């Protein structure tokens, strides 16, 4: 058991000048529980109304040893007292019950609680919310809601540490990660995840087969259902909100990967496949799917059905292996719904832009509109070091088509373990992709953000412009590289055009002239 | 002086494909870049915009087009544009050079140029130019904007930035200087640029009258055109579509007129209640352009500067007029492209392409992004890469880059590189989406290197080799790690491609 030397992340005020953390109090009628739903408020100058935005940053300045407040405790205890055969949001929704989690999400999304219940009940949205993750501020994932972003963190045998991964969780959520996954493959996996869960206000996912492999000393041939099952229960008891499980990597699909350029690039999927060939046996997660469901519906662990046969190169995009798995993902989805287990489906991968629409169309149909969860896609293989940009293109496009959760890709993809700077870069790039998708879907009020920043830009309220942005101190420091003076924060120009050539200032002149003399 | 070609692209060599222009016997040396790989893999040949290396800026590049131009002059001709020659059935040195660079038929190039669907920006005074073509049927091209302002930068910094931009893949540049020494700065750039150089003549015209738009007139504008055309400027952005009657259509806009040239014209028009003097003198402008072969980039002075303003009346009014000006320009054999948006949300991008294709008779489209959202100043190379890739996939021929300093200040050399890398990504992603021939060969080569753990090959094949390598080396710096079947992301036990090796080894022996 390590004694990590934790470093506090920069403060909320440092990251978001002129912002405050706020909460909307709403009362859950059936229980009388009071919910405090987070949002962030940007205070503007010149008498503009304050701008309210989503807030994933969670409780601030909490000592890691103490952990976040357990805000969901009285919800869980009351539902436990009332007695129930299943504990998932889907079960409650199908009973016609609007839970605290549903009301919370509804408020957070500014939609009707009954609409939220309906979407969860039909399986088109999920609320990943293990009853052991009491610290969680509930959120919803689904095509009819804001496009969400996941940040992957975790150590490897080669790099990082508990204190660095706890920093990265707090940092990822500060910049807007809606979920995280702890993908640790090194030492102290159980400990690392514990620290993260007790200090994360967003859902935390894992890939259980990683730790299962770590337990059998990295020898895949020594995996079996017993060790996998033990791992599922361990992680469920900690509070993991969703599991990526590669139960679609069937024995008969593995030969389909033989002629691929980059083979099987899924970590989990390659592990399952190796085990399958070694024994010529069927995927033990597939074989024990029912047993897995019986675990998940007692804790409410959502299942993220993995795509072990996702393409790892443009060359392999939309090939037979990938779509063979997708078909099976749909089967597993329907089976999970029978047991009231919440499901999302994992998708590609490396996919050129003209092949992206086929991916969405097939998933929507074959998986009956379960939420889709994509890694990018990366639209080209040529730019390692910049794969947050290559994949932002694909993420935005497939987001516009209905993808509900975008798994980020950092500048270090294909190169090494991301550090804290890489985590921020990835989150910012994917917040851009997710918001651009919200706009393309004409999601209600999404453009208000753009309009507020653009108004500040035209009116030369520079500090307002910075404060309204995704990353205020970056915008400001960039501006200030050439015009550092306080006075330049009210200039009707910047260094790009200078005072004589600033088009918005010239537009001010034009409108002044027209106001007096007409057009 | 900029980092060397070898420092930027390890294992790469600059090469040239030699071809002979039959009608003249002139020998053309068409550049390309070859990445030398390990393990017996064939070398990968890529496009190369970097131009002649290690030439001192005070000396300037060799004047490779001199004999081309001198001969065409001797032979006598009423017009000097690639469109005029193409329409005469002539395949010029520039067209053959382009065909060779694009790996396409010289006759196809001539056909595209003659119908106005592609342009070869190639002022006969820019003798240093290595010809390139802009058009939907060709590789998607990228433009880098550079230049000083009254507030920042200098002649040396801007000359650096032009060499730097082209090093990383800029296919054209524009010198948008609005500060001191505009004429001299542009001279240095033109003499040292192997790629087409564009300008916006109205900027220097305004500088000539000390920043007072009301003191502009046709005379000072025409003097500027002649001055810039004599230096060798390959294309002019001219906002002749900002008509007097369109200005009131911008009154309700959230961010008004964001075009620099556009706002200047609109101010002048309102001041005098007179029609745009570039519009009024369009015929005169064409009479200048077809003697130098200065291509015209018809500006979109009324582009949207916010998501709110996207695809509004003002924008489309100007687009209709751009089509008119395009057809008129073609009548005088002036090569034309049309400038486009702007700030446009993704669901509105398809309409932009559809309407430009129809209303402007398929002239090459030249977009600024577009930016798909306003929320992330500091990252507008990414917000706009999304838009650029998408509108490129629909047929946009030239993508004007957007740097991380957009809306914030004058980009520096780092920002220029970031801008070019982001846009080379967008351009290539568009090439793949268009299924442009051999486009995926690049991706396939790097991905093969990735799967076989030829790490140095992977780095060498990429858009920015040293960034890739330095990123990898942050956690695994030893030379030995360059042949490891893992990296620090997964480690030895969890690397999926190494596990795939194991899977295939097992199948090779025992079957599937
Ligand atoms: N510890 C960690 N921290 C952050 N991301 C991780 C991680 N472990 C795995 N990942 C993510 O999961 C991927 C698996 S390793 C290589 C996957 C491959 N590039 C592909 O296309 O799927 C990584 O590329 C990264 O996206
Ligand atoms: N000197 C220079 N160096 C690099 N880019 C320049 C430049 N001068 C102008 N530009 C480009 O031209 C633009 C004009 S100023 C503002 C334009 C506005 N943001 C819009 O959406 O169109 C700049 O934002 C930048 O993209
Ligand atoms: O084990 P594999 O590589 O499949 O999973 C790596 C990561 O990628 C995520 N992902 C998302 C879509 N496809 C894969 C997955 O949830 C996990 O975060
Ligand atoms: O004067 P304005 O702002 O129109 O032009 C600014 C820059 O933007 C470029 N551009 C490209 C498409 N629309 C505008 C134009 O060629 C020049 O590089
Ligand atoms: S000077 Fe140019 S870039 Fe700066 S605020 Fe004005 S219009 Fe925008
Ligand atoms: S360890 Fe993971 S990221 Fe690194 S080479 Fe192997 S598969 Fe790629
Ligand atoms: Cl990889
Ligand atoms: Cl601006
Ligand atoms: Zn990959
Ligand atoms: Zn702009």
């Amino acid at each position: 058991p390590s004694s990590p030397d934790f470093q506090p992340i920069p403060s909320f005020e440092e990251c978001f000048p002129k912002s405050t953390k706020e909460h909307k109090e709403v009362v859950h009628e059936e229980s009388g529980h009071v919910l405090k739903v987070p949002f962030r408020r940007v205070h503007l100058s010149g008498g503009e109304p304050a701008f309210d935005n989503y807030d994933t940053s969670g409780p601030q300045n909490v000592n890691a040893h103490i952990g976040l407040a357990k805000l969901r405790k009285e919800w869980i205890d009351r539902r436990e007292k009332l007695g129930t055969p299943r504990y998932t949001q889907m079960y409650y929704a199908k009973q016609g019950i609007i839970t605290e989690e549903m009301l919370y999400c509804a408020t957070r999304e500014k939609l009707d609680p009954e609409f939220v219940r309906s979407e969860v009940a039909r399986g088109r949205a999920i609320i990943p919310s293990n009853k052991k993750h009491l610290e969680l501020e509930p959120m919803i994932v689904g095509r009819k809601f804001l496009v969400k972003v996941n940040a992957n963190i975790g150590n490897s045998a080669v790099a990082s540490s508990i204190e660095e991964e706890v920093y990265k969780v707090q940092w990822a959520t500060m910049w807007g990660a809606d979920t995280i996954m702890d993908l640790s493959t090194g030492r102290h996996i159980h400990e690392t995840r514990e620290w993260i869960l007790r200090n994360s206000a967003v859902p935390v996912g894992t890939v259980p087969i990683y730790q299962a492999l770590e337990k059998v000393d990295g020898i895949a041939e020594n995996l079996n259902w017993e060790v996998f099952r033990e791992t599922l229960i361990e992680q469920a008891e900690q509070g993991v909100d969703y599991f990526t499980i590669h139960a679609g990597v069937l024995l008969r699909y593995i030969p389909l990967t033989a002629k691929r350029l980059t083979g099987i690039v899924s970590r989990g999927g390659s592990i399952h496949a190796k085990w399958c060939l070694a024994y010529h046996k069927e995927n033990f997660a597939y074989e024990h799917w029912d047993d897995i469901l019986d675990i998940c519906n007692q804790y409410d662990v959502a299942l993220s059905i993995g795509d072990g046969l996702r393409p790892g190169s443009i060359y392999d995009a939309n090939d037979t292996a990938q779509f063979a798995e997708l078909l099976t993902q749909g089967e597993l989805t329907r089976r999970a719904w029978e047991k009231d287990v919440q499901v999302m489906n994992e998708g590609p991968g490396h996919v050129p832009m003209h092949k992206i629409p086929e991916n969405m169309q097939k998933q929507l149909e074959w998986c009956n509109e379960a939420p889709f969860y994509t890694l990018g896609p990366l639209t080209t293989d040529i730019a390692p070091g910049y794969d947050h940009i290559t994949s932002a293109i694909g993420a935005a496009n497939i987001g516009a088509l209905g993808t509900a959760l975008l798994c980020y890709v950092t500048p270090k993809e294909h190169l090494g373990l991301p550090n804290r700077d890489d985590v921020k870069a990835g989150v910012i790039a994917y917040k851009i992709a997710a918001h651009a998708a919200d706009l393309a879907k004409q999601h209600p009020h999404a453009q208000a953000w753009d309009d507020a920043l653009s108004k500040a830009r035209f009116e030369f309220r520079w500090m307002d412009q910075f404060a309204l942005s995704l990353d205020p101190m970056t915008a400001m420091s960039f501006h200030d590289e050439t015009l550092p003076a306080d006075g330049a924060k009210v200039a009707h120009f910047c260094s790009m055009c200078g005072p004589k050539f600033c088009s918005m200032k010239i537009t001010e002149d034009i409108r002044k002239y027209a106001e007096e003399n007409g057009y």
Side-chain angles (χ1 to χ4, degrees), chain A residues 1-6 8-29 31-80 83-186 188-213 215-225 227-258 260-280 282-360 362-511 513-514 517-519:
Chain A
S2 306
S3 191
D5 183 17
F6 294 111
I9 62 163
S11 76
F12 180 95
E13 292 75 27
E14 290 180 74
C15 295
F16 295 96
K18 290 160 65 77
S19 290
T20 53
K21 290 182 58 85
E22 306 290 343
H23 293 81
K24 172 70 181 179
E25 289 193 9
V26 302
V27 183
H28 185 246
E29 283 299 311
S31 68
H33 293 150
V34 175
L35 320 189
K36 297 185 181 202
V37 192
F39 65 99
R40 172 166 65 95
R41 173 166 292 170
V42 184
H43 300 270
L44 303 176
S45 65
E48 293 286 325
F51 180 75
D52 297 347
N53 205 340
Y54 206 94
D55 184 15
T56 55
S57 60
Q60 292 297 297
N61 301 109
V62 172
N63 190 307
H65 298 91
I66 296 159
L68 297 183
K70 296 171 184 64
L71 77 96
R72 301 178 56 212
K73 183 186 164 56
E74 77 189 355
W75 313 352
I76 298 315
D77 289 347
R78 173 187 169 272
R79 291 204 296 258
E80 173 53 32
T84 178
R86 288 167 181 178
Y87 294 79
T88 67
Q89 295 296 317
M90 175 172 278
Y91 174 75
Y92 297 128
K94 286 168 164 180
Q95 294 289 126
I97 300 172
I98 298 175
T99 61
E100 289 92 322
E101 289 86 349
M102 289 170 209
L103 179 53
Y104 198 107
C105 293
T107 297
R108 213 169 178 184
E109 298 275 333
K110 302 191 290 291
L111 293 171
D112 196 287
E114 170 59 21
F115 179 66
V116 168
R117 192 212 50 86
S118 182
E119 288 293 299
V120 172
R122 69 197 299 163
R124 194 157 70 186
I126 65 167
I127 303 175
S129 55
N130 182 328
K131 74 190 187 189
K132 305 292 174 182
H133 192 188
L134 297 174
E135 300 86 354
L136 165 74
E137 298 168 342
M139 54 84 76
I140 187 156
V141 173
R143 187 178 181 193
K144 298 298 199 174
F145 305 93
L146 294 155
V147 179
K148 303 305 193 309
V149 166
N150 176 76
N152 289 329
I153 55 102
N155 65 31
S156 78
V158 181
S160 199
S161 65
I162 296 173
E163 49 266 50
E164 287 167 289
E165 297 309 314
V166 166
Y167 187 102
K168 278 153 65 170
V169 183
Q170 303 174 303
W171 202 223
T173 56
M174 175 66 68
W175 298 111
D178 299 284
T179 70
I180 69 102
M181 291 182 74
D182 179 353
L183 304 183
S184 294
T185 54
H188 297 312
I189 290 177
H190 180 100
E191 285 161 68
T192 304
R193 181 173 52 243
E194 187 70 25
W195 283 108
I196 286 159
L197 277 168
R198 308 281 74 88
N199 293 279
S200 176
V202 301
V204 176
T206 60
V207 187
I209 196 71
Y210 297 175
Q211 190 185 357
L213 186 65
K215 293 220 262 245
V216 289
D217 299 333
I219 299 181
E221 286 85 7
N222 290 338
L223 292 170
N224 52 75
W225 164 245
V227 57
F228 188 62
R229 184 183 191 272
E230 154 193 340
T231 302
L232 295 167
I233 290 168
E234 174 188 341
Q235 301 191 359
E237 283 290 330
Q238 292 184 272
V240 174
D241 297 297
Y242 66 96
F243 293 153
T244 295
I245 302 192
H246 301 87
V249 182
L250 303 188
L251 179 53
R252 66 187 178 269
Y253 297 167
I254 301 176
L256 305 177
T257 66
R260 283 184 152 197
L261 185 58
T262 46
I264 299 177
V265 293
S266 174
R267 188 185 287 161
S270 65
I271 294 172
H272 281 282
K274 188 178 171 171
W275 187 92
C276 285
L277 275 193
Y279 292 107
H280 299 272
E282 187 60 276
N283 186 310
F284 56 75
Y286 180 83
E287 293 291 83
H288 289 275
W289 196 241
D290 280 11
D291 290 335
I292 288 167
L293 302 181
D294 286 342
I295 292 166
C296 293
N297 64 11
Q298 294 306 291
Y299 294 88
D300 202 354
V301 182
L303 289 178
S304 184
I305 307 180
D307 64 332
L309 304 190
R310 70 171 175 272
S313 59
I314 300 301
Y315 183 93
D316 293 331
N318 298 23
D319 69 353
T320 298
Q322 172 190 345
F323 284 150
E325 183 176 43
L326 182 64
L327 185 62
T328 293
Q329 282 175 289
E331 173 204 324
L332 296 167
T333 296
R334 284 182 294 278
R335 291 176 56 188
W337 284 348
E338 294 193 278
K339 291 267 195 88
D340 297 324
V341 176
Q342 301 185 83
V343 172
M344 59 181 169
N345 304 133
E346 296 197 6
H350 295 227
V351 184
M353 290 176 79
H354 64 300
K355 284 182 169 181
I356 287 175
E358 172 177 35
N359 280 281
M360 193 74 220
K362 283 188 162 62
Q363 191 272 341
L364 284 167
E365 299 172 344
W366 300 1
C367 294
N368 299 105
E369 292 185 275
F372 201 24
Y373 179 18
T374 59
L375 183 60
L378 284 71
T379 59
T380 174
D381 304 328
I382 71 177
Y386 300 86
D387 276 328
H388 60 311
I389 300 174
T390 67
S391 65
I393 297 162
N397 276 273
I398 207 166
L401 294 174
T403 292
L405 185 56
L406 302 170
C407 189
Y408 81 175
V409 174
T410 73
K412 294 295 183 55
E413 188 81 357
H414 310 109
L415 296 173
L417 195 76
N419 60 45
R420 56 173 61 165
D421 294 350
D422 308 318
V423 173
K424 178 177 175 186
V427 172
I428 297 302
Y430 270 69
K431 282 297 286 178
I432 291 170
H435 185 73
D438 293 332
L439 294 174
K441 296 163 66 193
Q442 306 179 63
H443 194 79
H445 309 312
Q447 197 180 307
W449 194 352
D450 305 70
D451 291 350
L453 191 152
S454 283
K455 194 180 193 292
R457 172 169 294 149
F458 183 71
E459 291 175 358
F460 293 105
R461 292 182 278 112
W462 288 98
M463 289 302 309
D464 284 357
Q465 191 194 149
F466 305 144
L468 281 164
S469 74
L470 259 186
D471 181 6
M473 295 302 280
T474 287
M476 186 177 74
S477 62
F478 280 11
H479 171 270
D480 287 3
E481 290 176 28
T482 52
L483 292 176
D486 300 345
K489 304 298 202 298
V490 296
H492 291 207
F493 65 91
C494 73
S495 69
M496 179 74 79
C497 314
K500 303 279 196 62
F501 288 84
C502 174
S503 57
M504 290 184 302
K505 190 270 180 189
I506 293 174
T507 293
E508 289 181 345
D509 295 342
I510 287 165
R511 289 184 177 180
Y513 189 99
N517 315 331
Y519 279 114

